[PDB]
Symmetry: C3
Subunit: 120 residues, 3 copies
């Protein structure tokens, strides 16, 4: 009846990756008011659906972390992770760099130890 066809298939050699691209970039916002500090670290070009726990690591430059500034949120679908969080300025004292890490779950935890970071 209708014209048929039955081609055999052939593997391609350069099966290049597609989809979004891993290039950690970002801009932080350390807005400070009366005695609390809201911080909006907007990151882009991150990992499609990953967790990005970010806090304030004190001077130590692997040092201790004021864990009372943990912000946990997930990375959208193109790596558009937007972290936010309030912390009394008194706790913040002696913090030197806001380190962004990957997470193992929305319950904090540490997977990667410093994917992106900035002084203050």
């Amino acid at each position: 009846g209708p014209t048929e066809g039955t081609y055999t298939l052939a593997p391609q050699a350069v099966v290049k990756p597609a989809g979004p691209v891993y290039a950690p970039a970002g801009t932080a916002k350390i807005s400070e008011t009366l005695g609390v500090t809201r911080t909006t670290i907007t990151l882009t070009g991150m990992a499609p659906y990953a967790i990005y726990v970010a806090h304030y690591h004190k001077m130590g430059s692997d040092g201790p972390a004021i864990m009372e500034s943990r912000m946990i949120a997930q990375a959208s679908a193109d790596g558009k992770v937007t972290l936010t969080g309030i912390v009394p300025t008194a706790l913040i004292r002696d913090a030197a760099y806001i380190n962004v890490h990957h997470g193992r779950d929305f319950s904090g935890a540490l997977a990667d130890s410093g994917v992106i970071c900035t002084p203050i």
Copy 2:
């Protein structure tokens, strides 16, 4: 009970993965009826439970996908996926190749840029 036993473990010398072997093969079969085209493509040796989006790409190898010819399916558990579809023969009048890609999700974008391809 009356007899015990205690043995410390040793991690062998080399551990080898088993199950399916990623050997992409294929079998395209077109049957163009009255202003319509059915396409049953059988891919064996694929990735155990992956998505396999398939389209008819125009000339320009390289060139634009006729998006109205998408066929999507999963590869069972040994890497056997079967792609079926139905498209008017007027839209695929300039198709030069049927490119099979991997999928990111059920009905969605590509994760690769062509794993296996047959020339038409």
Copy 3:
């Protein structure tokens, strides 16, 4: 006075992991009573969350496995699997090495072919 500072973050360079180190190690306690054998393989330093099928491979290394001894279990969040199994002694007669493997499914399956093995 909303003291606000905007800082661009650097893409880092040191991204070493943070969690269970895959270092397979453990012991075995095969205990015979009145014609039955109870085997307890407590492992540590394993994959954090993975099914670990373990059975008795006979002599022959390759060799068949008396599959009437498959001990299945999953690991915790540090990598601690506790395999436990009841097998008639007459069955495990002529067994040579208890081979632990990886489980593709809770139904069993040998993803890996021996991540750790103990001579019995």
